[PDB]
Amino acid sequence: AIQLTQSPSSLSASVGDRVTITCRASQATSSYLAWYQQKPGKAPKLLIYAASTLQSGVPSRFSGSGSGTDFTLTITSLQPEDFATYYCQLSKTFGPGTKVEIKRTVAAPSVFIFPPSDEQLKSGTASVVCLLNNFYPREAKVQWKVDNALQSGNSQESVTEQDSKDSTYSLSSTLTLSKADYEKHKVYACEVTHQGLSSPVTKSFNRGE
Amino acid sequence: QVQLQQSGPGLVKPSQTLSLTCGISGDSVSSDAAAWDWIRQSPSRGLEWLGRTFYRSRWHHDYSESVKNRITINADTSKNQFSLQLTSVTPEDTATYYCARAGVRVFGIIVNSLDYWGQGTLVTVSSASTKGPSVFPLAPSSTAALGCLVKDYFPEPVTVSWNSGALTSGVHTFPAVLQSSGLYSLSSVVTVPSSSLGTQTYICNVNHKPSNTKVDKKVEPKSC
């Protein structure tokens, strides 16, 4: 029945920053507040219980405080591996989470373009893939040009979670055409605009070349 | 640690029953110091406690109001496991389901914090048929990147390894996207030294357990 809020809902902080995250309860209870850390593809990991007791093995840069209805998790010097969503828990209720992203220096993507395989073309469809590797910040503009004609509505992007070591992202953009439509054009190009690049990078191929 | 191993199918048709099992190693399901929980997680609803079973003088059950009259959590002492059964599922029940152990010793008592967790089971509520992926090479261009396109499968998830697990550095396996067909697609890429392209073999190993699909695809420079 208790309800929990967390503030901020997300934050971006540089390595070495002091980070403070708050949890607020809608009423006082007899239960003990726990803090969890969840990294991508993994279960939440208990960091702190009874509001302030650090779980064995957790680095001492993590600490918890508070009382009544107001609790805090502090990270004294944020590290790259601390990218995660942090959750409080009281009785059987979880807070909505605070997403912590590591702010780092700009990093330009390395760009790669892949034509469809001959195997896929026999099946009647053509996937063209553009890869943006190991960049920061996450925002990026990828445009597909087919014979210099801007494409719209026929591509989908996917982005990795922030890397726990170098704090970068990678991104894929996949252009999907029928085999017939793919065969009616020659120049396939992926044009990348990003904060790390002083001017756009284009990677391209000529169908059949 | 106490180890929690989850099993059970992820895909459940609307109105039918979700059944999962959690096998325990390193504690006894009957321990009077433990409690055994099911939790689920979704982008929409966050983390939600579903229910709990534990043994003291008898077996006890505590369930969330959110799944009232649909949930059963039973322990099996002979197998040292506990299970979740959720009946009459709807698309609102699509989520990743976790088992967990509640109980941490502090202040001479036990607080019900979740110290150990299962690996999670993605459960998709859908009437659609299972389909295994096609796997296509993303060939290195003639410092170097290559990959595999894993296209048109249902439901999630797939796993992708490289060189049977030997190759991990520089791998990026992207989150799947749901295409207009209702089938998922993803790519897995890796960057490697350009000098290796002629002599080092690169094979992506794709496993799609719902369809019993296993595919190995060798990724090599395109000839002509």
Author numbering:
A (entry chain B): 1 to 91, 96 to 213
B (entry chain A): 1 to 35, 35A, 35B, 36 to 52, 52A, 52B, 53 to 82, 82A, ...
Original paper wording:
To elucidate the binding interactions of L5A7 with HA we determined the crystal structure of the L5A7.5 Fab fragment as well as the cryo-EM structure of the L5A7.5 Fab bound to the HA from Indo05. The L5A7 lineage has sequence characteristics described for the VH6-1 class of influenza antibodies, such as the usage of the IGHV6-1 gene, 17 amino acid long CDR H3, and presence of the CDR H3 “FG” motif; however, the light chain V-gene IGKV1-9 usage is unique. All L5A7 lineage members showed potent and broad neutralization. Antibody L5A7.5 was comparable to MEDI8852 in potency and breadth, neutralizing all tested strains with IC80 titers < 4.5 μg/ml.
The VH6-1 class of antibodies includes some of the broadest and most potent antibodies that neutralize influenza A virus. Here, we elicit and isolate anti-idiotype antibodies against germline versions of VH6-1 antibodies, use these to sort human leukocytes, and isolate a new VH6-1-class member, antibody L5A7, which potently neutralized diverse group 1 and group 2 influenza A strains. While its heavy chain derived from the canonical IGHV6-1 heavy chain gene used by the class, L5A7 utilized a light chain gene, IGKV1-9, which had not been previously observed in other VH6-1-class antibodies. Antibodies of this class show characteristic immunoglobulin sequence features, such as the use of the IGHV6-1 gene and the presence of an “FG” motif in the third heavy chain-complementary determining region (CDR H3).
